[PDB]
Amino acid sequence: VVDPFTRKEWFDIKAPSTFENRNVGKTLVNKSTGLKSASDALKGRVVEVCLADLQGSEDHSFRKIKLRVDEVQGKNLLTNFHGMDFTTDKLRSMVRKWQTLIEANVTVKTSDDYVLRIFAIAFTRKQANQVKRHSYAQSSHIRAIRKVISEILTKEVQGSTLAQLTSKLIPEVINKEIENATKDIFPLQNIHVRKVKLLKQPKFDVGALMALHG
């Protein structure tokens, strides 16, 4: 029996800062030979840690999150951001029949020379004195609302660093910086940002990325 079980050795993430917990747990890639073994074939993965998995209590527990393996050294392995998402359960539970969905996105930049496509998702609240059973806006609202969410996303992403960005939307109050504009248009319950993702970077800049650890 070739029994490869004995063969290889685990390695480790921990999270960058802008969080509180960071210990990821462990991986298994290969022994580090040289004739092709891990220096180069590292930093090419992601993992799926929930957020209440990562910071706290479950007031924070729906967001999926990607994390891109960045670089490795001795007992290093360290993973920066790659994007984020919601989770099937709540989105399928927030899309109730008899109300209006509203979804929009924009591709915008941060001082960290990452462009990216944000998303946003909002729904209708029925004024809680009200008899009519469907609670629909009237597309004077839908257009003006997505006009104003689009006003706001860019002025926080162009607002600052992808790192400060993470620190901006973790506390989530962007969600109701939306409701700030919206309260003068429509009741608009359940307002979340509901994904984030891009593909292009500035070439690695090793020394920038170690500024999230201590």
Partner 1 sequence: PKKRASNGRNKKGRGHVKPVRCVNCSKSIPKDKAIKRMAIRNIVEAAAVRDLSEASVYPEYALPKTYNKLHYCVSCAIHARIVRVRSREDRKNRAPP
Partner 2 sequence: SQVFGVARIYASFNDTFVHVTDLSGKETIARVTGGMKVKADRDESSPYAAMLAAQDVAAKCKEVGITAVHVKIRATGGTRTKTPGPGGQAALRALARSGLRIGRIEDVTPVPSDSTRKKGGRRGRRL
Question: CA 130, 182, 108, 43 torsion: positive or negative?
Answer: negative
Judged by CB under 7 A, does residue 32 bind RNA? no
Cα separation, 122 vs 160, whole angstroms? 24
Three-state secondary structure call for residue 70 = strand
Judged by CB under 8 A, does residue 87 bind partner 1? yes
Site string for partner 1, 97-126 (x = CB under 8 A): ------------------------------
Residue 113's binding partner out of RNA, partner 1, partner 2, none, with CB under 5 to 8 Å set by partner kind: none
Residue of the chain from 31, 75, 97, 203 that contacts RNA (CB under 7 A) = 97
Site string for partner 2, 82-101 (x = CB under 8 A): -----xxx------------
Minimum CB distance to partner 2, residue 80 (Å): 14
How far is CA 71 from each of CA 43, 198, 199, rounded to the nearest angstrom? 5, 19, 17
Enumerate the β-bridge partners of residue 10: 28
Helices (H), the chain: 51-54, 88-94, 140-157, 162-169, 174-182, 206-209
88 vs 140, beta carbon nearer partner 1: 88
Judged by CB under 7 A, does residue 95 bind RNA? yes
Cα separation, 81 vs 16, whole angstroms? 9
Minimum CB distance to partner 1, residue 89 (Å): 3
Cα separation, 182 vs 146, whole angstroms? 10
Number of residues that bind partner 1 (CB under 8 A): 9
Residue of the chain from 61, 150, 164, 167 that contacts partner 1 (CB under 8 A) = 61
Residue 27's binding partner out of partner 2, partner 1, RNA, none, with CB under 5 to 8 Å set by partner kind: partner 2
Cα separation, 199 vs 61, whole angstroms? 25
Q: How many CB atoms sit inside 10 A of residue 192's CB?
A: 21
What would the two tokens of residue 44 be? Answer: 């090419």
Judged by the rule CB under 8 A, the positions of this chain that interact with partner 2 are 5, 25-30, 44-48, 50, 53, 64, 69, 87-89
Judged by the rule CB under 7 A, the positions of this chain that interact with RNA are 44-46, 66, 82, 91-92, 95-101, 103-104, 127, 129-136, 138, 141-143, 146-147, 183-187, 199
